[PDB]
């Protein structure tokens, strides 16, 4: 079990903490959040009370470092920070526990909701995606932009997800236009899988990563970038049986844990309609197809 | 961005383009076989893609044996499209290869975006315009010479004859257009317009008949008249 603790709550915020979220207000006595399961990724975000806009938030592994959190007026917003006094920082956390001012990572035993989510998401890789190499966190907001969409402008404020196109040279080998723009199977499992994510794994961490930054932070081309990655599978003949089943589980739990009244913007209709309904793919996502007829029935 | 009566006059421009029709790229009849059940034969078709400025036509005849053995061939006859339209382009001098493609079906879209990756300065547009390009093969010389083909062939027309030497290309089309158009709605009346007079001859080299200026307005006219004659057929007005 790891801590992380806050400095001090200087303003009204609703704090999340992985699925979980709490209202804070105004210079309430709040130091941090206890109980903190070691052995996957984590990420602590925020919403001001006085601005529904831009949730912002800290992706983070406590096995990386001692993290804290701490309220920058010049910025005006929360500030992840590293403590490199390995004593100092036991010496703060265990002092807020006695004083019992500190909440905690509310898990229930049955559930693997959060490992079921962020299963394949490596802190390594989250760090390329969000470059900022001076620091073992990774901060995302609802504004960043990604690369592909810079291409279509500060690239320091970049999502670097990996770049989807299925009209490109990339995704078409000359001669076989028609075959490979029907059945990307070439450009998945030759150029994206063993070409640049060199294997599942890793592909399916951006896959999460992507999704879960659309889902806390409402990041538009997150969500983009997650659609993208599931329609290359779908439509694509030639799958690993492997990659199919872990593909179900992996979008079950995200339609599982998604917001309810958010699905109108967070699903993309067609690339639903055909992964489920008219790609080769359309059998092989039983659980995921289960769960989304019987929770979002008007979107197909 | 797509076509419509707002930038109509954008094709007579200087910027090269081409228009691409495919819809007699894979024609087929239906027939009865000797078990009771439906079943399909397929003839020559073409591709029509053609200059609105200047007239000039790139006919690629399509021969049913490219049909041969292939699955989902109406899916298949728009990447064909794309993939002829394509080399057409390779084959022309840079100079000479088009800005904008324009397909009259929306579904030629992907197709030749695929096709023309290796174009990319190539804008691909859909129209919203219902031109009557289909009636191509009413032209007697463009069907004559797609149904006698043995093998693929591109054949070069100009599809104005010579009438750029005495109107603009905006002209030129409006009575392409309505020449085709009148040949859709009704193919045998439009062409008793044109050939009811026997004195009026084609030129070897020609696809209309060598219409002196007033008489194209006579014949420009009854077309109209047919137009809408048929019009209220339809729609009983």
């Given amino acids: 079990m790891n801590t992380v603790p806050f400095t001090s709550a200087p303003i009204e915020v609703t704090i999340g903490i992985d699925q979980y979220s709490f209202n804070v207000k105004e210079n309430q006595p709040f130091h941090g959040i206890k109980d903190i399961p070691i052995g996957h990724v984590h990420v602590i975000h925020f919403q001001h009370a006085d601005n529904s806009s831009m949730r912002y938030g800290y992706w983070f592994d406590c096995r990386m470092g001692n993290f804290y959190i701490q309220y920058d007026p010049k910025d005006g917003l929360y500030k992840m920070m590293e403590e490199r006094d390995g004593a100092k920082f036991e010496n703060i956390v265990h002092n807020f526990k006695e004083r019992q001012m500190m909440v ?17 998401v490596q802190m390594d890789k989250i760090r390329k995606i969000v470059r900022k190499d001076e620091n073992q966190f990774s901060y995302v907001d609802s504004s960043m932009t990604t690369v592909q969409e810079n291409e279509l402008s500060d690239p320091a404020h970049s999502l670097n997800y990996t770049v989807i196109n299925f009209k490109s040279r990339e995704a078409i080998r000359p001669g076989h236009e028609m075959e490979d723009f029907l059945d990307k199977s ?9 070409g640049i994510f060199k294997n599942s794994s890793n592909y399916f961490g951006e896959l999460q990563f ?17 659609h993208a990655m599931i329609e290359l599978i779908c439509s694509s003949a030639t ?8 593909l179900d589980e992996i979008l079950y739990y995200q ?9 109108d913007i967070l699903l993309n209709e067609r690339v639903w309609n055909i992964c489920l309904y008219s790609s080769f793919q359309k059998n092989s996502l039983h659980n995921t197809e289960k769960i989304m007829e019987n929770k979002y029935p008007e979107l197909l | 961005g797509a076509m419509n009566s707002s930038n109509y006059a954008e094709l007579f421009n200087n910027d090269i383009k081409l228009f691409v029709d495919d819809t007699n790229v894979y024609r087929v009849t239906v027939h ?3 078990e009771g059940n439906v ?57 000479e290869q088009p800005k904008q493609i324009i397909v009259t079906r929306k579904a030629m879209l992907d197709p030749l975006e695929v096709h023309m990756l290796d174009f990319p300065n190539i804008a691909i547009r859909p129209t919203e ?3 009557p390009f289909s009636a191509a093969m009413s032209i007697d010389k463009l069907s004559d010479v797609v149904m006698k083909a043995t093998e693929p062939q591109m054949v070069l027309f100009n599809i104005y004859d010579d009438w750029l030497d005495r109107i603009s290309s905006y002209t030129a089309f409006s009575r392409l257009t309505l020449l085709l158009r009148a040949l859709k709605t009704n193919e045998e009346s439009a062409k008793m317009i044109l050939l009811s007079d026997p004195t009026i001859t084609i030129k070897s080299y020609h696809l209309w008949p060598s219409f002196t200026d007033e008489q194209w307005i006579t014949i420009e006219s009854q077309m109209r008249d047919l137009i809408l004659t048929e019009y209220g057929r339809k729609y009983n007005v």
């Fill in chain 1, 255 to 263: 339609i599982k844990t998604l917001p309810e009244q958010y699905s």
């Fill in chain 1, 104 to 120: 905690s990572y509310p898990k229930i035993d049955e559930d693997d909701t959060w490992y079921n989510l962020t299963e394949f």
């Fill in chain 1, 186 to 194: 070439y450009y998945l499992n030759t150029v994206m899988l063993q």
């Fill in chain 2, 32 to 34: 009865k076989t000797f």
């Fill in chain 1, 239 to 246: 799958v690993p049986k492997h990659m199919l089943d872990k």
């Fill in chain 2, 129 to 131: 315009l219902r031109l």
């Fill in chain 1, 210 to 226: 992507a999704f879960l930054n659309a889902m806390f932070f409402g990041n538009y081309g997150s969500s983009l970038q997650w």
């Fill in chain 2, 39 to 95: 079943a399909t034969k397929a003839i020559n078709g073409c591709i029509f893609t053609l200059n609105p400025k200047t007239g000039h036509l790139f006919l690629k005849i399509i021969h049913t044996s490219v049909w041969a053995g292939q699955k989902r061939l109406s899916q298949l006859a728009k990447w064909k499209t794309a993939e002829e339209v394509s080399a057409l382009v390779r084959s022309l001098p840079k100079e």
